[PDB]
């Protein structure tokens, strides 16, 4: 894939003349900061030149014993004063400059973002309604804060950091050439091999990356299927059969993960070799040029570093480019919306605004097709008039085009052909806001906004008084119930507040329209979702609302329409018939046909996690030794680098300056080789140690997950997705807290430990300065990581309130356009952004300082060392070689632990990722399905008995469900459970399945308490038939055979089960009869046919109990009767408990139980409970209507 982007010059629109100034000044700062370090290398060379000019004089030949001390040392004391005044001068200039760099760029970005948010949100509120039809709203809402966040990255400080790095790239290669061009051109001849070597691996590391996500996608698809279907898994006890499927597809991503683990460390050691190799080749050649008195030692050390600084400056500007390019990419999708102009402008002020509107409506030859499918036409040549004050009712079948009428009259769409007119004037010639202000809509499903009732009404009109709210509420028949609410009119409604009934919400929606006082009223299926009781009060409110207004209603439920003035019957976008109720009933057309049919913070320890990888201890031993060696190469380099410069800066005969240097020069390749080996071995032992640990933990987890009982899967935290996540990536991230953490610690110890030792003996005074400053500079890098993340939470949390407003407006956009309150949410959006704006303008002031005080404390400490270290050479207390042997042992070694710790996986994220694993493993359930003990008798009777069971769902222990529920079920007969809502009938199936235990009471099977039986054997002789049957992506034969696990199951056994389920006849005509793959790829079976499979699945087990829980939850009229044939067949000679909602099934049952509030109110046969004239008699009386 390749996504488009914006031109550079476009993207920086919305940048006023002040914003254009900050970026320019911010650059000139960034340029200075970029060159600031090259000058430190240039001075560093001139520093060693002063030391080298005397380093060999005073040693070989002794002119005087103490009159020569002053001679050479008073020369250095005057030369080293300037080099020290120079070093502090940079850190002072950095402190100023580094502030300007970050401050001015983040400021110019902030002023632009604030304009973008408002310009982008207003752009969305201005779009057409056909525009919302095509686009996915979910991405759009995230696009308001994700793409906007993506632009903010690539126009803030990240540009300042780019011009800083490029000012070093040119600033570095400049001083290299101008102080000595031969040695640089050597290095620039090998660096293409390094830029080549780096890119080739990133192509192979991205190769072994994307090969991995599609490798676990096979396993993770099994994880997502099971943990969503866990109720069927536990019910049929396939908790070991799903483990093998998940495991057999789990070794692929292990062997593949090693090919990354090897290659990932080759790419390091290969590129790390080429550093040490390019080190020798530049030092071997750089030393040959000082022997001949062409260069000094200062010239080599400047040019060699200043190239590597300027060369490594590329890699420091790579992500800052990608952020700027990602910012252009995200800015394209945004700026498209701002510059997109609609034909139906809800903000324009063009058309007329006619007063004293009578409401004469007309439709003239309307042809319309929704923008999703132009090819199909909904309306074709539709003509219709509506006289002022009259009510017209539109009726028809499906695909008729009724709801289009409401949507064309608000002008949410423009008709292709024809003309919609109000009072003889075309609708397209009047102003849109005034049009929708003179119209009130009453949609099918009523919407309420997360505010008070008063604000919900004030969205009808912002300037309404509280007296007018009371009147409009009274007219809507909503007053008396509002006064019964706790906080009267200030009661908080919406998603956030108390839930109101459906009939109550729609009456509020009326009051919004009534406040507008419209001349036209539109009702789009206003009472479809409401029941018979709530509809009656609303119709009185609507009939009141219609008085003196022209009205068009999209009417279902035809009885409400009989008193209407005129009816219109639709067939294929055309009105076929029109007249009064009596006329169309007489016509015996379309309308007559319709009327007559009606009438997360756990604490895991480091030692616990490490024990998980204990079964591969030999891999850990090698990685420790190997980690020590690579940790030893860093202080080794400090010697070999110092021993080189020690030759030409302490004194020696030119007879030995060749073999010493060439030795030390080729000792870098020795370090370079050993680097390549230790990386090739670090990722071969700790690498496999991590990829084994992933596979073994994903198995242990998914094993332990299925062990858990149902109350665990009932939790809100343990959702099927959050468990697949926990099983997918969290299971693998543990390895960053086992062997990787030992590779770190042994490398950090072997480096900084042995580096501390050496520097202490070679110079005990200077180290106490540096090892006192290293803690200071390391802390500063941490506090920036803190305040960068602690501020990331603060700003991103202040923005959700702004985002809640937007989310409320996008998710209900069709509403707000009808209320014409686009401007309101715009202001509400802007008012919410006033807080993060004024906060972010001081954020740049902060991060300007924290960036300056980090860089300045480094350059000042660079001067505090080479000032104090110079004082140690003047007093003859240490050699300049020992300075570099101290400095490049502590500093370059203290930098090494960061380059290590920053390369390894996130240890904090790894430990918490591991603590979640251990809980999921070490958790044993109240009901161990994997257990083996239990009575498990040879008694095949089937006497069920509940005795006073008391149960509360542990997810909600406050509510009760069952209180003293007792009931028996004799062998072979049927028991039916019925009741109102929240009675507890479905709990019986789950307690006999033993998904949960009861708090008190007991459940017996064949006179034996089920808590003593084996759980698998209990569920074995129970045949569950769930409401919505879960079918797995597999063939018919395997899905049915899943019922009875651990059986040979041959061809002969399969067909008998499908026969008795009444699918054999339907199957035999299907393509490839019983081998037909079922799932998303294969044939889609109807809801009734799926249930017969779940019945067939239960029949193969041959259980002596059958639980039927709300089966037949569908309207498949033909397939319905087929299911009941199969259901009656299964119950004939088995103990049966039925969760009854259909009144036809229960009449022939042997016994019935009416439950209410966990108590049996009455029980008996059908005829007895009918003659009881109690609760059960009330239920049968309802169907007589
Ligand atoms: Hg910033
Ligand atoms: Hg319709
Ligand atoms: Hg290693
Ligand atoms: Hg130093
Ligand atoms: Hg119920
Ligand atoms: Hg399957
Ligand atoms: Hg039965």
UniProtKB/Swiss-Prot annotation:
Decide whether keyword rRNA processing is in the record: no
Catalytic reaction equation(s): ATP + H2O + xenobioticSide 1 = ADP + phosphate + xenobioticSide 2; ATP + H2O + phospholipidSide 1 = ADP + phosphate + phospholipidSide 2; a 1,2-diacyl-sn-glycero-3-phosphoethanolamine(in) + ATP + H2O = a 1,2-diacyl-sn-glycero-3-phosphoethanolamine(out) + ADP + phosphate + H(+); a 1,2-diacyl-sn-glycero-3-phosphocholine(out) + ATP + H2O = a 1,2-diacyl-sn-glycero-3-phosphocholine(in) + ADP + phosphate + H(+)
Q: Which residues lie on this side of the membrane: Extracellular?
A: 40-85, 178-184, 286-299, 642-665, 763, 867-882
Q: Which Enzyme Commission number(s) are on file for it?
A: 7.6.2.2, 7.6.2.1
Which sites bind ATP 2?
Answer: 979-986
- Quote the record's activity regulation: Translocase activity is inhibited by verapamil and is sensitive to energy depletion. C1orf115 regulates drug efflux through modulation of ABCB1 localization and activity.
Entries under SMART domains matching the protein: AAA
Give the residue spans that cross the bilayer. Answer: 17-39, 86-106, 156-177, 185-205, 264-285, 300-321, 621-641, 666-686, 742-762, 764-783, 844-866, 883-904
Give every ABC transporter domain span: 361-597, 944-1182
Q: Does the keyword tRNA processing apply?
A: no
**Topology, Cytoplasmic side:** 107-155, 206-263, 322-620, 687-741, 784-843, 905-1185
Which positions fall inside the ABC transmembrane type-1 domain? Answer: 23-326, 620-909
- Entry GO CC: apical plasma membrane; brush border membrane; cytoplasm; intercellular canaliculus; plasma membrane
**Where is it located?**
Cell membrane; Apical cell membrane; Cytoplasm
- One Gene Ontology term of the molecular function aspect: ATPase-coupled transmembrane transporter activity
Report the Gene3D superfamilies cross-referenced here: ABC transporter type 1, transmembrane domain, P-loop containing nucleotide triphosphate hydrolases
Enzyme class comes to translocase
Q: Give the bilayer topology.
A: Multi-pass membrane protein
Sites carrying sugar chains:
56, 60, 63
Binding of ATP 1 occurs at: 396-403
Q: Which GO terms describe its biological process?
A: cellular hyperosmotic salinity response; cellular response to alkaloid; cellular response to antibiotic; cellular response to borneol; cellular response to dexamethasone stimulus; cellular response to estradiol stimulus; cellular response to external biotic stimulus; cellular response to L-glutamate
Further comment found in the protein's record: In mouse the MDR gene family includes three or more related but distinct cellular genes.
The entry's family comment says:
Belongs to the ABC transporter superfamily. ABCB family. Multidrug resistance exporter (TC 3.A.1.201) subfamily.
Query: How is this protein organized at the quaternary level?
Result: Interacts with PSMB5.
Quote the function comment for this protein. Answer: Translocates drugs and phospholipids across the membrane. Catalyzes the flop of phospholipids from the cytoplasmic to the exoplasmic leaflet of the apical membrane. Participates mainly to the flop of phosphatidylcholine, phosphatidylethanolamine, beta-D-glucosylceramides and sphingomyelins. Energy-dependent efflux pump responsible for decreased drug accumulation in multidrug-resistant cells.
UniProt-recorded name of the protein = ATP-dependent translocase ABCB1
């Amino acid at each position: 894939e390749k996504k488009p982007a914006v031109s550079v010059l476009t993207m920086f629109r919305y940048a006023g003349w002040l914003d254009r100034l900050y970026m320019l000044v911010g650059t000139l700062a960034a340029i200075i900061h970029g060159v600031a370090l090259p000058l430190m290398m240039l001075i560093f060379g001139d520093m060693t030149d002063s030391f080298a000019s005397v380093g060999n004089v005073s040693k070989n030949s002794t002119n005087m014993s103490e009159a020569d001390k002053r001679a050479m040392f008073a020369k250095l004391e005057e030369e080293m004063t300037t080099y020290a005044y120079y070093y502090t001068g940079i850190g002072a200039g950095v402190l100023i400059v580094a502030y300007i760099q970050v401050s001015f760029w983040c400021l110019a970005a902030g002023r632009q973002i604030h304009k973008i948010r408002q310009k982008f949100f207003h752009a969305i509120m201005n779009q057409e309604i056909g525009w919302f039809d095509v686009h996915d709203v979910g991405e759009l809402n995230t696009r308001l804060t994700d793409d906007v966040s993506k632009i903010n990255e690539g126009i803030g400080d990240k540009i300042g950091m780019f011009f800083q790095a490029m000012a070093t790239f040119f600033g570095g290669f400049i001083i290299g050439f101008t102080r000595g061009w031969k040695l640089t051109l050597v290095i620039l001849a090998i660096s293409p091999v390094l830029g080549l070597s780096a890119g080739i691996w990133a192509k192979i590391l991205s190769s072994f990356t994307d090969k991995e996500l599609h490798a676990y996608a096979k396993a993770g698809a099994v994880a997502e299927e099971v943990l969503a279907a866990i109720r069927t898994v536990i019910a049929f006890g396939g908790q070991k059969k799903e483990l093998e499927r998940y495991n057999n597809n789990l070794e692929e991503a292990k062997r593949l993960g090693i090919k990354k683990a090897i290659t990932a460390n080759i790419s390091m050691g290969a590129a790390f070799l080429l550093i040490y190799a390019s080190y020798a080749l530049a030092f071997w050649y750089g030393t040959s040029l000082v022997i001949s008195k062409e260069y000094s030692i200062g010239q080599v050390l400047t040019v060699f570093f200043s190239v590597l600084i300027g060369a490594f400056s590329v890699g420091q500007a790579s992500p800052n480019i990608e952020a700027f390019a990602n910012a252009r990419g995200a800015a394209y999708e945004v700026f498209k919306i701002i510059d997109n102009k609609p034909s139906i402008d809800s903000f324009s002020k063009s058309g007329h605004k006619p007063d004293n509107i009578q409401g004469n409506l007309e439709f003239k030859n309307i042809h319309f097709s929704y923008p999703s499918r132009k090819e199909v036409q909904i309306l074709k040549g539709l003509n219709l008039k509506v006289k002022s004050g009259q009510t017209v009712a539109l009726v028809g079948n499906s695909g008729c085009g009724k709801s289009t009428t409401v949507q064309l009259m608000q002008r949410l769409y423009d008709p292709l052909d024809g003309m919609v007119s109000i009072d003889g004037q075309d609708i397209r010639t009047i102003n849109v806001r005034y049009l929708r202000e003179i119209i009130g809509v009453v949609s099918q499903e009523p919407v309420l906004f997360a505010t008070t009732i008063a604000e919900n009404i004030r969205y009808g009109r912002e300037d309404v008084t509280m007296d007018e709210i009371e009147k409009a509420v009274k007219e809507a028949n909503a007053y008396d119930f509002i006064m019964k609410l706790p906080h009267q009119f200030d009661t908080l409604v919406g998603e956030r507040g108390a839930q109101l009934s459906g009939g109550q919400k729609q009456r509020i929606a009326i009051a919004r329209a009534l406040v507008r006082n419209p001349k036209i009223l539109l009702l789009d299926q206003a009472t479809s979702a409401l029941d018979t009781e709530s509809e009656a009060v609303v119709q009185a409110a609507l009939d009141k609302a219609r008085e003196g207004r022209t009205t068009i209603v999209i009417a279902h439920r035809l009885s409400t329409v009989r008193n209407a003035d005129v009816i219109a019957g639709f067939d294929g976008g055309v009105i076929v018939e029109q007249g009064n109720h009596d006329e169309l009933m007489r016509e015996k057309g379309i309308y007559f046909k319709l009327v007559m049919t009606q009438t997360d913070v756990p604490p895991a320890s480091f030692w616990r996690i490490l024990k998980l990888n204990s079964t591969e201890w030999p891999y850990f031993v090698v990685g420790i030794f190997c980690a020590i060696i690579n940790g030893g190469l860093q202080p080794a380099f400090s010697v070999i680098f110092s021993k080189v410069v020690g030759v030409f800066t302490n004194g020696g005969p030119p007879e030995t300056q060749r073999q010493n240097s060439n030795l030390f020069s080729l000792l870098f390749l020795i370090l370079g080789i050993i680097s390549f080996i230790t990386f090739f071995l670090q990722g071969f032992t700790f690498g496999k140690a991590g990829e084994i640990l992933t596979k073994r933990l994903r198995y242990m987890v998914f094993k332990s997950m299925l062990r858990q009982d149902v109350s665990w899967f009932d939790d809100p935290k343990n959702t099927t997705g959050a468990l697949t996540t926990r099983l997918a990536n969290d299971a693998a991230q543990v390895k960053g807290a086992t062997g990787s953490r030992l590779a770190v610690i042994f490398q950090n110890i072997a480096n900084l430990g042995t580096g501390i030792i050496i520097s202490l003996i070679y110079g005990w005074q200077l180290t106490l300065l540096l090892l006192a400053i290293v803690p200071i500079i390391a802390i500063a890098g941490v506090v920036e990581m803190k305040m960068l993340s602690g501020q990331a939470l603060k700003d991103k949390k202040e923005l959700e309130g702004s985002g809640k407003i937007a989310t409320e407006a996008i998710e209900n956009f069709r509403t707000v356009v009808s209320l014409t309150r686009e401007q309101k949410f715009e202001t509400m959006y802007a008012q919410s952004l006033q807080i993060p704006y004024r906060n972010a303008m001081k954020k740049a002031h902060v991060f300007g300082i924290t960036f300056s005080f980090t860089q300045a404390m480094m350059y000042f400490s660079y001067a505090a060392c080479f000032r104090f270290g110079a004082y140690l050479v003047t007093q003859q207390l240490m050699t300049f070689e020992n300075v570099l042997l101290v400095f490049s042992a502590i500093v370059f070694g203290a930098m090494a632990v960061g380059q290590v710790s920053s390369f390894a996986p996130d240890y904090a994220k790894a430990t918490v990722s591991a603590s979640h694993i251990i809980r999921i493993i070490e958790k044993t359930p109240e009901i161990d399905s994997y257990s083996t003990q239990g009575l498990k008798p040879n008694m095949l009777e089937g006497n069920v008995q509940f005795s006073g069971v008391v149960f509360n769902y542990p997810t909600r222990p406050s509510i009760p469900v069952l209180q003293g529920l007792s009931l028996e079920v004799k062998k072979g007969q049927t028991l039916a459970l019925v009741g109102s809502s929240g009675c507890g009938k479905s709990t019986v199936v789950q307690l006999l399945e033993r998904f949960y235990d009861p708090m008190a009471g007991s459940v017996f099977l064949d006179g034996k308490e089920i808590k003593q039986l084996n759980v698998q054997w209990l569920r074995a002789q129970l045949g569950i038939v769930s409401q919505e049957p879960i079918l797995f992506d597999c063939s018919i034969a395997e899905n049915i055979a899943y019922g009875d696990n651990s059986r040979v199951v041959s061809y002969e056994e399969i067909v008998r089960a499908a026969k008795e389920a009444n699918i054999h006849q339907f199957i035999d005509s299907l393509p490839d009869k019983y081998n037909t793959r079922v799932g998303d790829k294969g044939t889609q079976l109807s809801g009734g046919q799926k249930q017969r499979i779940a019945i067939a699945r239960a029949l193969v087990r041959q259980p002596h109990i059958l639980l039927l829980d709300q089966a037949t939850s569908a309207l498949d009229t033909e397939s319905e009767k087929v299911v009941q044939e199969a259901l009656d067949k299964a119950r004939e000679g088995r103990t049966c408990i039925v969760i009854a909602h259909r009144l036809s099934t229960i009449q022939n049952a042997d016994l019935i139980v009416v439950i209410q509030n966990g108590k049996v109110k009455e029980h008996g046969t059908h005829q007895q409970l009918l003659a009881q004239k109690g609760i059960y008699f009330s239920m049968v009386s309802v169907q007589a209507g």
